[PDB]
Symmetry: C3
Subunit: 151 residues, 3 copies
């Protein structure tokens, strides 16, 4: 059975600071299922589309070039309420506003270096997933512990 | 030398997902003293009594069967304000409402699979402990680091 | 280049309970920079000054001798908003009011045994750092991952 999916990316500061495993570990631990993962240095043009709603923000151009300046881990995670719950796990947009226990709360300080991205809605998630993954790159499989995560 | 006591159980999903040590470790780190522990697959009826106050809820009979379907770690933990603090450490009834940093927040998703139980009051704690433990099974001992936990 | 600094101390219960590495590790993970560290058993007189604004509290005299009864780790940490953020990472003054994920939240129970100290303002931090460290003992240096922590 297919459940809600979200797009999660480890940003270049996340890769650079050796936080990839730690982030993935947190999601496995939570009980969510990895459905897609790739490792790329995406194009400025891809990122511009990824962040289209902020295109008019002053930090937008720096943001888009920066997010394309190095490799990122692109992920798709699956599970009930994974979009909003992933956000909670991340913390807030600004690390300064993120609680200890969250990923941004434990590991970073500034809004422009906040190591992780997550879709903010099912609508954004469906678009971001389609943007970063070809349908074939999404793997359908059954986690055997599923019966201990879901009634 | 005797302090407040609460009943904590690692539920069958907690056991299945290999979270026993992780749960106990959090209680040791916090500074609480272990007073009783056993490992059983309890009878459906023991669970019916454990959750007697929920007998009229629609999820109750299923709850009781699930909670008796596999082994659980039954514990009694001791220390100042341990009943309510354990609740804080667990999170909310619903993992969806539990914060990162809490046990349900970090490890589970669904209300019916929330890996851990904790007494909600001293009075419930007194009843749950007597139900799961024989008086002889509660161990009286002194943790020597106590003087660094308690003024 | 030069950022805000705060004074953090591992208190005698922290040292005694073997939590020094855990605490330091939490600050390294967050991205803050160590500028100073020493390990001393300070004088009652130094502590009376350290806590001078609390001079009228009934717990003040007990506090100053306890904080001088054993070795503490004295530290200076540097980074954007490190005064307030360090406080957040600690939790609240009372471990009872501190959330899971914070240092007091994960590790302590009583207000008098809350293992860590942190300056409550840039002003107090400037005084406490100056109280505990000689200008020569403060290290000014550049962490090479700094460019992934700060725009
Ligand atoms: N005020 C700001 N100044 C500089 N960079 C910012 C910024 N706000 C956001 N950025 C960066 C960091 C964010 O991860 C990225 C996307 O912003 P967002 O979508 O509004 O928040 P979020 O990443 O939590 O979804 O833009
Ligand atoms: N709406 C619900 N649907 C399915 N199972 C539920 C449920 N609400 C509670 N359960 C289960 C999970 C709870 O841990 C267990 C005990 O109920 P409770 O006493 O109200 O909560 P708690 O475990 O927080 O003390 O009952
Ligand atoms: N009511 C109280 N009873 C006993 N000890 C207390 C106390 N309040 C504070 N202490 C101790 C623990 C505190 O960390 C220390 C300093 O007090 P504080 O400056 O008011 O708060 P904080 O340590 O959070 O900056 O004094
Ligand atoms: Mg967004
Ligand atoms: Mg209950
Ligand atoms: Mg103070």
């Amino acid at each position: 059975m297919v459940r809600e999916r979200t797009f999660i990316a480890v940003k270049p500061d996340g890769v650079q600071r050796g936080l990839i495993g730690e982030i993935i570990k947190r999601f496995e631990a939570k009980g969510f299922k990895l459905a897609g993962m790739k490792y790329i240095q995406a194009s400025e043009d891809l990122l511009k589309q990824h962040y289209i709603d902020l295109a008019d923000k002053p930090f937008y151009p720096g943001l888009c070039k920066y997010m394309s300046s190095g490799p990122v881990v692109a992920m798709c995670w699956e599970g009930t309420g994974v979009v909003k719950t992933a956000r909670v796990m991340m913390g807030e947009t600004r690390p300064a506003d993120s609680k200890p226990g969250t990923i941004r709360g434990d590991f970073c300080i500034e809004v422009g270096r906040n190591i992780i991205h997550g879709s903010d809605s099912v609508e954004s998630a469906n678009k971001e997933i389609a943007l970063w993954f070809k349908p074939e790159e999404l793997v359908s499989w059954t986690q055997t512990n599923e019966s201990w995560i879901y009634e």
